[PDB]
Tab-separated table of C-alpha atoms in Angstrom:
chain	number	residue	atom	x	y	z
A	1	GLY	CA	4.685	-26.587	-4.178
A	2	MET	CA	2.380	-26.870	-1.216
A	3	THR	CA	4.604	-28.764	0.669
A	4	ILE	CA	6.577	-25.646	1.187
A	5	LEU	CA	4.553	-24.550	4.221
A	6	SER	CA	5.584	-27.604	6.009
A	7	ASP	CA	8.740	-26.586	5.044
A	8	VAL	CA	8.496	-23.327	6.528
A	9	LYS	CA	7.012	-24.628	9.744
A	10	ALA	CA	10.094	-26.795	10.102
A	11	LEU	CA	12.049	-23.811	10.013
A	12	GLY	CA	10.006	-22.217	12.724
A	13	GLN	CA	7.610	-19.749	11.040
A	14	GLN	CA	4.084	-19.923	11.149
A	15	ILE	CA	2.098	-18.576	7.814
A	16	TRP	CA	-1.071	-17.026	8.589
A	17	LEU	CA	-3.677	-16.003	5.992
A	18	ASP	CA	-4.065	-12.128	5.892
A	19	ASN	CA	-7.988	-12.264	4.748
A	20	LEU	CA	-11.282	-13.309	6.318
A	21	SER	CA	-14.578	-13.739	4.961
A	22	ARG	CA	-17.936	-15.274	5.614
A	23	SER	CA	-17.591	-17.582	2.376
A	24	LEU	CA	-13.884	-18.347	3.380
A	25	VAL	CA	-15.157	-20.178	6.446
A	26	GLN	CA	-18.592	-21.256	5.041
A	27	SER	CA	-17.223	-23.228	1.782
A	28	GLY	CA	-14.689	-25.141	3.647
A	29	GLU	CA	-11.785	-23.538	2.458
A	30	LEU	CA	-10.259	-22.150	5.786
A	31	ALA	CA	-10.579	-25.876	7.030
A	32	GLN	CA	-8.572	-27.405	4.229
A	33	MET	CA	-6.189	-24.609	4.321
A	34	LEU	CA	-5.697	-25.447	8.283
A	35	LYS	CA	-4.844	-28.873	7.022
A	36	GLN	CA	-2.407	-27.734	4.034
A	37	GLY	CA	-0.018	-25.605	6.418
A	38	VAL	CA	-1.751	-22.502	6.873
A	39	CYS	CA	-1.684	-21.742	10.681
A	40	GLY	CA	-3.834	-18.786	11.426
A	41	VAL	CA	-5.911	-15.732	10.050
A	42	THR	CA	-5.596	-11.948	10.454
A	43	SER	CA	-8.070	-9.483	9.623
A	44	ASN	CA	-8.301	-5.616	9.678
A	45	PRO	CA	-10.858	-2.929	8.869
A	46	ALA	CA	-9.710	-3.113	5.044
A	47	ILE	CA	-10.023	-6.547	4.974
A	48	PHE	CA	-13.748	-6.237	6.281
A	49	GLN	CA	-14.519	-3.487	4.049
A	50	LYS	CA	-13.758	-5.500	0.768
A	51	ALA	CA	-15.280	-8.731	2.350
A	52	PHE	CA	-18.576	-7.317	3.402
A	53	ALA	CA	-18.583	-5.326	-0.095
A	54	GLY	CA	-17.783	-8.399	-2.278
A	55	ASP	CA	-19.069	-11.697	-0.463
A	56	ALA	CA	-22.299	-12.493	-1.616
A	57	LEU	CA	-23.168	-14.370	1.984
A	58	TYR	CA	-23.460	-10.956	3.595
A	59	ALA	CA	-26.407	-9.585	2.065
A	60	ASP	CA	-28.893	-12.008	4.019
A	61	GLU	CA	-27.194	-10.854	7.387
A	62	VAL	CA	-26.997	-7.480	6.680
A	63	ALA	CA	-30.773	-7.603	5.624
A	64	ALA	CA	-31.550	-9.380	8.876
A	65	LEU	CA	-29.431	-6.785	10.858
A	66	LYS	CA	-31.500	-3.883	9.345
A	67	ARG	CA	-34.685	-5.491	10.957
A	68	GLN	CA	-33.176	-4.654	14.403
A	69	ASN	CA	-32.515	-1.411	16.260
A	70	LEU	CA	-28.705	-1.442	15.808
A	71	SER	CA	-26.031	1.232	15.226
A	72	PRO	CA	-23.982	0.819	12.144
A	73	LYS	CA	-21.035	-0.232	14.494
A	74	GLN	CA	-23.028	-3.005	16.211
A	75	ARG	CA	-24.160	-4.317	12.460
A	76	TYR	CA	-20.612	-4.369	11.611
A	77	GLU	CA	-19.777	-6.133	14.881
A	78	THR	CA	-21.817	-8.780	14.821
A	79	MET	CA	-20.961	-9.622	11.455
A	80	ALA	CA	-17.303	-9.647	12.183
A	81	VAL	CA	-17.569	-11.402	15.402
A	82	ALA	CA	-19.560	-13.896	13.745
A	83	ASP	CA	-16.695	-14.361	11.292
A	84	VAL	CA	-14.193	-14.629	13.662
A	85	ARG	CA	-15.951	-16.995	15.892
A	86	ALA	CA	-16.560	-19.483	13.050
A	87	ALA	CA	-13.173	-18.916	11.881
A	88	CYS	CA	-11.772	-19.770	15.440
A	89	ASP	CA	-13.863	-23.195	15.433
A	90	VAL	CA	-12.153	-24.223	12.191
A	91	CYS	CA	-8.681	-23.193	13.929
A	92	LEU	CA	-9.468	-24.638	17.363
A	93	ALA	CA	-8.200	-28.176	16.351
A	94	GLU	CA	-4.880	-26.807	15.456
A	95	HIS	CA	-4.684	-24.456	18.064
A	96	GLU	CA	-5.359	-27.077	20.769
A	97	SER	CA	-2.689	-29.637	19.019
A	98	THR	CA	0.180	-27.265	20.034
A	99	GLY	CA	-0.711	-26.185	23.503
A	100	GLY	CA	-2.510	-22.914	22.303
A	101	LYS	CA	0.668	-21.688	20.165
A	102	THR	CA	-1.012	-21.626	16.940
A	103	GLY	CA	-4.404	-21.376	15.312
A	104	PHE	CA	-4.981	-17.653	15.958
A	105	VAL	CA	-7.723	-15.530	14.399
A	106	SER	CA	-7.189	-11.738	15.121
A	107	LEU	CA	-9.970	-8.990	15.145
A	108	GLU	CA	-9.163	-5.476	15.447
A	109	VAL	CA	-10.748	-2.828	17.832
A	110	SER	CA	-11.918	0.063	16.341
A	111	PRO	CA	-9.481	2.661	15.043
A	112	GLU	CA	-10.967	5.492	16.713
A	113	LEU	CA	-9.772	4.134	19.999
A	114	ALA	CA	-6.210	4.169	18.936
A	115	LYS	CA	-5.287	6.794	21.404
A	116	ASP	CA	-7.545	6.231	24.006
A	117	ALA	CA	-5.808	3.481	26.556
A	118	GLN	CA	-9.037	2.693	28.554
A	119	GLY	CA	-11.653	2.663	25.597
A	120	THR	CA	-8.993	0.265	23.959
A	121	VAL	CA	-9.175	-1.969	27.140
A	122	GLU	CA	-12.772	-1.675	27.400
A	123	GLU	CA	-13.508	-2.552	23.899
A	124	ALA	CA	-10.853	-5.545	23.945
A	125	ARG	CA	-12.296	-6.976	26.833
A	126	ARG	CA	-15.667	-6.776	25.588
A	127	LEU	CA	-14.421	-8.137	21.812
A	128	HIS	CA	-12.786	-11.099	23.774
A	129	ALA	CA	-15.900	-11.858	25.603
A	130	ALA	CA	-18.002	-11.705	22.790
A	131	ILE	CA	-16.051	-13.905	20.461
A	132	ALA	CA	-15.867	-16.289	23.500
A	133	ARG	CA	-12.833	-18.510	22.055
A	134	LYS	CA	-9.510	-18.967	23.154
A	135	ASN	CA	-7.792	-18.698	19.826
A	136	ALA	CA	-9.061	-15.332	19.236
A	137	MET	CA	-6.277	-12.563	19.735
A	138	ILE	CA	-7.332	-8.946	19.744
A	139	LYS	CA	-5.715	-6.441	17.764
A	140	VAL	CA	-4.727	-3.104	18.939
A	141	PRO	CA	-2.354	-0.432	17.340
A	142	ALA	CA	0.843	-0.037	18.958
A	143	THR	CA	0.430	3.855	19.728
A	144	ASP	CA	1.781	4.818	23.107
A	145	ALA	CA	-1.996	4.252	24.228
A	146	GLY	CA	-1.940	0.881	22.738
A	147	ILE	CA	1.349	-0.547	24.669
A	148	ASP	CA	-0.471	1.045	27.773
A	149	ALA	CA	-3.484	-1.104	27.104
A	150	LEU	CA	-1.124	-3.967	26.058
A	151	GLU	CA	0.109	-4.267	29.511
A	152	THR	CA	-3.374	-4.429	31.240
A	153	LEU	CA	-4.848	-6.935	28.621
A	154	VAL	CA	-1.868	-9.031	29.424
A	155	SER	CA	-2.422	-8.820	33.020
A	156	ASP	CA	-6.004	-9.722	32.200
A	157	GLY	CA	-4.847	-13.076	30.372
A	158	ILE	CA	-5.877	-11.763	27.063
A	159	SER	CA	-3.952	-12.478	23.778
A	160	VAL	CA	-3.328	-9.626	21.956
A	161	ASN	CA	-1.738	-8.992	18.317
A	162	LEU	CA	-0.019	-5.580	18.708
A	163	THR	CA	-0.250	-4.055	15.200
A	164	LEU	CA	0.897	-0.997	12.881
A	165	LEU	CA	4.712	-1.214	14.310
A	166	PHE	CA	7.244	0.264	11.914
A	167	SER	CA	9.827	0.898	14.936
A	168	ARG	CA	12.233	-1.123	16.702
A	169	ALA	CA	12.008	1.528	19.577
A	170	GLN	CA	8.378	0.978	19.991
A	171	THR	CA	8.517	-2.780	19.393
A	172	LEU	CA	10.869	-2.829	22.358
A	173	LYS	CA	8.554	-0.810	24.326
A	174	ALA	CA	5.720	-3.214	23.478
A	175	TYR	CA	7.925	-6.202	25.067
A	176	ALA	CA	8.552	-4.279	28.046
A	177	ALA	CA	4.513	-3.650	28.752
A	178	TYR	CA	4.150	-7.279	28.090
A	179	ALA	CA	6.711	-8.541	30.564
A	180	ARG	CA	5.419	-6.185	33.155
A	181	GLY	CA	1.785	-7.717	32.569
A	182	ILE	CA	3.064	-11.003	32.640
A	183	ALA	CA	5.165	-10.394	35.981
A	184	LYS	CA	1.639	-8.894	37.304
A	185	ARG	CA	0.293	-12.479	37.082
A	186	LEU	CA	2.870	-14.273	38.195
A	187	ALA	CA	3.230	-12.241	41.345
A	188	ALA	CA	-0.524	-12.922	41.741
A	189	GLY	CA	-0.362	-16.591	41.253
A	190	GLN	CA	-2.134	-16.528	37.732
A	191	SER	CA	-1.658	-18.753	34.948
A	192	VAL	CA	0.493	-17.175	32.058
A	193	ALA	CA	0.962	-20.290	29.642
A	194	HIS	CA	-1.965	-19.624	27.621
A	195	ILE	CA	-1.462	-15.807	27.004
A	196	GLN	CA	0.263	-15.677	23.287
A	197	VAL	CA	1.048	-11.967	21.864
A	198	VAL	CA	2.293	-10.974	18.508
A	199	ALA	CA	4.139	-7.943	17.372
A	200	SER	CA	2.797	-7.327	13.638
A	201	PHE	CA	5.807	-5.419	12.060
A	202	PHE	CA	5.068	-4.031	8.658
A	203	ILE	CA	6.995	-4.421	5.726
A	204	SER	CA	6.117	-3.050	2.302
A	205	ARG	CA	4.822	0.360	3.670
A	206	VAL	CA	8.687	1.318	4.598
A	207	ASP	CA	9.939	0.323	0.955
A	208	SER	CA	6.548	1.917	-0.448
A	209	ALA	CA	7.740	5.487	1.495
A	210	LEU	CA	11.404	5.405	0.764
A	211	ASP	CA	12.223	3.666	-2.689
A	212	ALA	CA	11.332	6.515	-5.032
A	213	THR	CA	14.118	9.028	-3.221
A	214	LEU	CA	16.799	6.056	-2.467
A	215	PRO	CA	19.903	5.648	-4.183
A	216	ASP	CA	20.255	2.285	-6.251
A	217	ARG	CA	21.858	-0.025	-3.848
A	218	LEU	CA	19.216	0.459	-1.166
A	219	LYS	CA	15.971	0.303	-3.284
A	220	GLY	CA	13.694	-2.352	-2.100
A	221	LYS	CA	16.099	-3.125	1.158
A	222	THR	CA	15.083	-0.859	3.910
A	223	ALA	CA	12.039	-3.102	5.080
A	224	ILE	CA	14.021	-6.277	5.383
A	225	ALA	CA	16.831	-4.540	6.821
A	226	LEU	CA	14.728	-3.338	9.469
A	227	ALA	CA	12.785	-6.544	10.014
A	228	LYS	CA	16.097	-8.117	10.398
A	229	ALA	CA	17.468	-5.690	12.808
A	230	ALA	CA	14.300	-6.023	14.831
A	231	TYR	CA	14.376	-9.681	15.034
A	232	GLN	CA	18.255	-9.223	16.428
A	233	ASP	CA	16.501	-6.896	18.967
A	234	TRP	CA	14.119	-9.600	19.977
A	235	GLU	CA	16.639	-12.666	20.275
A	236	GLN	CA	18.463	-10.055	22.925
A	237	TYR	CA	15.462	-9.048	24.709
A	238	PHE	CA	13.944	-12.434	25.256
A	239	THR	CA	17.246	-14.201	25.850
A	240	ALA	CA	18.416	-12.098	28.851
A	241	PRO	CA	18.102	-12.779	32.092
A	242	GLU	CA	15.321	-10.584	32.919
A	243	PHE	CA	12.973	-12.406	30.527
A	244	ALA	CA	14.584	-15.995	31.230
A	245	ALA	CA	13.120	-15.615	34.567
A	246	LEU	CA	9.697	-15.239	33.297
A	247	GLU	CA	10.151	-17.964	30.516
A	248	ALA	CA	10.968	-20.620	33.310
A	249	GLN	CA	7.936	-19.939	35.176
A	250	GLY	CA	5.744	-20.498	31.878
A	251	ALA	CA	5.803	-17.399	30.285
A	252	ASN	CA	5.829	-17.232	26.532
A	253	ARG	CA	7.872	-15.030	24.301
A	254	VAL	CA	6.198	-12.352	22.073
A	255	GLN	CA	6.584	-13.455	18.571
A	256	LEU	CA	7.127	-11.107	15.748
A	257	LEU	CA	4.738	-11.283	13.072
A	258	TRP	CA	5.531	-10.000	9.500
A	259	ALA	CA	2.677	-7.874	8.108
A	260	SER	CA	2.116	-5.907	5.067
A	261	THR	CA	4.270	-8.842	3.182
A	262	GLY	CA	2.633	-8.617	-0.180
A	263	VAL	CA	4.665	-7.001	-2.548
A	264	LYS	CA	3.488	-3.529	-4.013
A	265	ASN	CA	6.201	-2.478	-6.197
A	266	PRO	CA	6.385	-4.775	-9.554
A	267	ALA	CA	9.972	-3.881	-9.769
A	268	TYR	CA	10.543	-6.747	-6.913
A	269	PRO	CA	9.649	-10.175	-7.136
A	270	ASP	CA	6.412	-11.112	-5.624
A	271	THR	CA	7.578	-13.329	-3.014
A	272	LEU	CA	10.355	-10.986	-1.853
A	273	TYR	CA	9.188	-10.410	1.635
A	274	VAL	CA	8.304	-13.875	2.668
A	275	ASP	CA	11.099	-15.293	1.032
A	276	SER	CA	13.526	-13.211	2.785
A	277	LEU	CA	12.001	-13.192	6.594
A	278	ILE	CA	11.723	-16.971	7.639
A	279	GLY	CA	13.521	-17.694	11.145
A	280	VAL	CA	12.775	-19.177	14.115
A	281	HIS	CA	9.721	-18.339	16.432
A	282	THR	CA	8.231	-15.777	13.931
A	283	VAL	CA	4.969	-15.332	12.262
A	284	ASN	CA	4.438	-14.030	8.550
A	285	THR	CA	0.717	-13.284	7.536
A	286	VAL	CA	0.342	-13.173	3.732
A	287	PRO	CA	-2.590	-12.122	1.385
A	288	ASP	CA	-4.236	-14.728	-0.699
A	289	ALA	CA	-2.223	-13.682	-3.848
A	290	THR	CA	0.828	-13.877	-1.864
A	291	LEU	CA	0.279	-17.357	-0.180
A	292	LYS	CA	-0.403	-18.469	-3.879
A	293	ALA	CA	3.003	-16.959	-5.320
A	294	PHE	CA	4.933	-18.417	-2.325
A	295	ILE	CA	3.648	-21.811	-3.101
A	296	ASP	CA	3.923	-22.019	-6.588
A	297	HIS	CA	7.687	-20.460	-6.542
A	298	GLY	CA	8.637	-19.492	-2.999
A	299	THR	CA	11.914	-20.848	-1.413
A	300	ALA	CA	11.798	-22.265	2.177
A	301	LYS	CA	15.119	-21.203	3.676
A	302	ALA	CA	16.283	-19.578	6.950
A	303	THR	CA	16.888	-16.213	5.579
A	304	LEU	CA	15.941	-13.757	8.277
A	305	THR	CA	19.221	-14.062	10.226
A	306	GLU	CA	21.382	-14.231	7.131
A	307	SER	CA	23.829	-11.372	6.779
A	308	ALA	CA	22.732	-9.251	9.505
A	309	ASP	CA	26.087	-7.177	9.155
A	310	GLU	CA	24.818	-5.883	5.767
A	311	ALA	CA	21.353	-4.925	7.446
A	312	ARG	CA	23.226	-2.845	9.801
A	313	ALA	CA	25.370	-1.205	7.235
A	314	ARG	CA	22.276	-0.722	5.008
A	315	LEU	CA	20.251	1.232	8.059
A	316	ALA	CA	23.462	3.377	8.725
A	317	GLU	CA	23.355	4.540	5.208
A	318	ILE	CA	19.566	5.520	5.615
A	319	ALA	CA	20.558	7.544	8.514
A	320	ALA	CA	23.371	8.853	6.539
A	321	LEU	CA	20.964	9.924	3.825
A	322	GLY	CA	19.009	11.677	6.386
A	323	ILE	CA	15.995	9.166	6.998
A	324	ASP	CA	15.217	9.272	10.566
A	325	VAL	CA	13.669	5.555	10.603
A	326	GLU	CA	11.741	6.614	13.736
A	327	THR	CA	10.148	9.478	12.360
A	328	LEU	CA	9.142	7.540	9.669
A	329	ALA	CA	7.656	4.763	11.764
A	330	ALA	CA	5.242	7.383	13.417
A	331	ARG	CA	4.116	8.914	10.194
A	332	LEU	CA	3.414	5.427	8.744
A	333	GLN	CA	1.452	4.513	11.805
A	334	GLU	CA	-0.580	7.530	11.925
A	335	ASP	CA	-1.170	6.953	8.100
A	336	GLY	CA	-2.207	3.576	8.362
A	337	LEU	CA	-4.531	4.302	11.351
A	338	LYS	CA	-5.966	7.124	9.102
A	339	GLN	CA	-6.373	4.323	5.970
A	340	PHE	CA	-8.039	2.045	8.675
A	341	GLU	CA	-10.670	4.673	9.924
A	342	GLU	CA	-11.168	5.390	6.406
A	343	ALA	CA	-11.902	1.826	5.482
A	344	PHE	CA	-14.140	1.722	8.643
A	345	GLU	CA	-16.128	4.676	7.683
A	346	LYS	CA	-16.768	3.208	4.168
A	347	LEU	CA	-17.754	-0.312	5.353
A	348	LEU	CA	-20.100	1.280	7.984
A	349	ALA	CA	-21.958	3.437	5.153
A	350	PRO	CA	-24.049	0.841	3.656
A	351	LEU	CA	-24.818	-0.790	7.256
A	352	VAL	CA	-26.783	2.488	8.212
């Protein structure tokens, strides 16, 4: 039942909604969710493509914007920024209640900037200012350029959702860039206590890539094992003396956020990823149908750190089979960028 969301909060995990639309906010539904245990919202270009295509409340907004001399991209941005600012206003009470630790809404920069660090910084700073809310996160793909941009944006005091992570190595590079940005601010006497970063580590896409060719005992296990190992890496990085010296001065840890947690293979229970990845100081962003399923028949238990030995053994067998999870991660990130660009082009076409 609904109280499962508050049970998961007590285990130290926030559950965010992986959807946004004009009607979600305008109907009052998002406000009611933020009382029932939902703690934030994520978007991406595919989410907006589907929302713009199916939500009746955009029609008048598009007609109004087609009366102005605007590029399709600025029509999209005006719509999306308006949705994000309205959602931020709904989530502000939650955000302020925890000292700025919850109640975030994420907006992703244009996919075409993913390999352009400077362009990404420029757009992220601009979208941060355009939204004009303290609880907005700018979402940046974790390419090498995005990790460059992360350091700069953190040093600028901007909260960031670093996305399309599939690699433990790349995630550790992101933590190091975050720490460099934090150290910069502390050296300059600037505040850090309100800077929040999440590392959105994708789940289902790993199993989708591998399962058809894996042995029995590994089907449906790799993505969870990879996340469990990533969380162990997280514990080790953020408790080390180097980060402790920053946390003592007010720095916040990055938090892992499990994304792509809707189950895509009907051979697995629909709550598999949410049920399996609950641990302290994490987030899980879930699509509506998965949120529904978890409320109905999910289980709140601290599963993320259970059986870490088996996760390690499974990843060792994945390597034994010749699957290089770092090569896979790079491909999956590339493929995700191509897919997001496809979705973005699809949504822009009706805005011409």
